[PDB]
Amino acid sequence: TPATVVAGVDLGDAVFAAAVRAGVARVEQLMDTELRQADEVMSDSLLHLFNAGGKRFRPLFTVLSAQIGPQPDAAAVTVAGAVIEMIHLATLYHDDVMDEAQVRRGAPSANAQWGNNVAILAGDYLLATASRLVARLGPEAVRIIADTFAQLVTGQMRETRGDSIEQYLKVVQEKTGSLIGAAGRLGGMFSGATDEQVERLSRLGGVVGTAFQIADDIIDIDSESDESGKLPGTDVREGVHTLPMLYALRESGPDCARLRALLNGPVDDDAEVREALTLLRASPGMARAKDVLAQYAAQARHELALLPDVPGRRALAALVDYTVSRHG
Amino acid sequence: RTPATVVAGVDLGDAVFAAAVRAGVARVEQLMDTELRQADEVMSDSLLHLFNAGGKRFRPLFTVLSAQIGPQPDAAAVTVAGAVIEMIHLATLYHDDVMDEAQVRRGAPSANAQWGNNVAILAGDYLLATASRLVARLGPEAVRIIADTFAQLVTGQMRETRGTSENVDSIEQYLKVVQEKTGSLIGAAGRLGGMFSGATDEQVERLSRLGGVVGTAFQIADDIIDIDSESDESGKLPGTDVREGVHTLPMLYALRESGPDCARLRALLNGPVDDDAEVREALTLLRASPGMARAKDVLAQYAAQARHELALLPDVPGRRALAALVDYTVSRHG
């Protein structure tokens, strides 16, 4: 693992990487401290996912966004990182209940080990914790995080009420773009970046988050649990039709009637899920989804290009390549 | 059928006072209605489902009555506080109905019966964002109070579902749980009502203490209502605690009795009960148990404590209405 690599992204320079690595570690320490302040009745459920792993993509994105401003190591950037990751963690607790996930980060899901009730409450406690933490940053950050969480939940809700491509693109911008947008906005604000750099990092975050979710939906089909830390074909199993599945479902082919039959609702038979994965992996619809993913990567590169010629810009460019190429 | 608003079920005192209080609670309602209707269309059905079905609006009334202690009871900030408290309450009902597998709330299908657990989970999560954005209007002190209050409420819910291996008396553990899951939020209603009405530091602390005691009484009443009320009285199905395996105060005292009726109840309550005839039998035994009398004695002790708490407030109409609200807390049948 190269010394220039932090949370899977080659940042290109070992001293810059060490600084970003330290920034991501400070976020981890503030979260670890806040989770361990909880009542003993909360502690085990709260540590369950936190200690299992996770890429810390959102702390990395926050810290890289803060590298654009003149105070990237500001205490307030660490608080912003911790707020974003706390919200992210809260959403995994609820999302794994909603998707009936048995595995998360290569271990039993919070709901598999503790049950849905403990998982729902662990997620609610993390949202209270995020709320107390963001209060430290002032009223503008409080409003950004409340609005951000409203958007994220709107996306989750839009997905559940939900085969439309435009609806899917609104879902992923809401449920995944909004929070990475907020990470960029807050990393910019609390590093002392300019108003213009703050808006550019927010737009970048939103596009990166959209790309991130499309890659997640591809990972659902193309990755094995060894790389993803979760069960492939969860979207097939739950009847969530993501972009590769929507494009596969618009194909004509000797197996397309069979795939239409398999994906016509939730799939509770694991062998049928595996059969649907075989058909999806071979579908030209997968290449169509990957081409859309590349279009979002191109939009993100268009956004970040007008940041300054500073290590943070190169590091964001490498993060965009990681967002779309990662296997987990 | 579902219980009426608390403001319709108490003697508020003189007409000029009843006027002022009814209007205060209506302003809370009007602000919540507006805030719920600003959500994206995709949220709208689920966010309005429980709010429109009914609910007693106990917590708006508690906030408004707490504000009558202060010299600015009708301040816009009091209305905001009342809406924030009820928005948090509403969020907890969406999650609690999922966790308790409740099919009925406020005389309607629960949000989870209507749309499934996922819609209810997300409607609850959204309401937290709404409450958060509203309380931001009141400043950082209020933001912190609501964060800590929600954290405590959630801790109480977790403590109920997890149980404990600590050396605690079951009644002692029960009282700690209900103080967290129900007391914290009514205490916060007293605190914010006192704060934003300009009440003294001592009055603010007293109202917070009063709300905590009233919330204990409120939850003991809720646990009795689960056994003793029919669905037309409570707006929900009796015997949910028996079905889910939650041992409430009447159940804890019922199981300390000796004899065959206790043996029969002990067998029925050994875990969750899914058979409707067994749930009815347990309810019959619980209604008849001296354990129910013991639970009502504790309810009466908390009513007396609440009367003692509110006696430290000034001799003003708000105080007399808070006394009527204590009486309602323990006398209601939904």
Ligand SMILES: C=C(C)CCOP(=O)(O)OP(=O)(O)O
């Ligand atoms: C929004 C999505 C796709 C949930 C998973 O997020 P990550 O893939 O960032 O999960 P962890 O690395 O935190 O485990």
Ligand SMILES: C=C(C)CCOP(=O)(O)OP(=O)(O)O
């Ligand atoms: C936590 C969020 C916002 C949900 C992301 O969508 P997914 O449901 O596809 O995420 P994974 O469970 O696949 O990580």
Ligand SMILES: C=C(C)CCOP(=O)(O)OP(=O)(O)O
């Ligand atoms: C804390 C508890 C017992 C949940 C129900 O509260 P209420 O009995 O006040 O419910 P609504 O009137 O708002 O429906």
Ligand SMILES: C=C(C)CCOP(=O)(O)OP(=O)(O)O
């Ligand atoms: C919403 C909260 C804090 C739960 C109160 O306990 P219950 O689970 O007994 O409340 P009901 O469902 O009976 O209203």
Ligand SMILES: [Mg+2]
């Ligand atoms: Mg999921």
Ligand SMILES: [Mg+2]
């Ligand atoms: Mg999901």
Ligand SMILES: [Mg+2]
């Ligand atoms: Mg996924």
Ligand SMILES: [Mg+2]
């Ligand atoms: Mg319940």
Ligand SMILES: [Mg+2]
């Ligand atoms: Mg409950």
Ligand SMILES: [Mg+2]
């Ligand atoms: Mg109850």
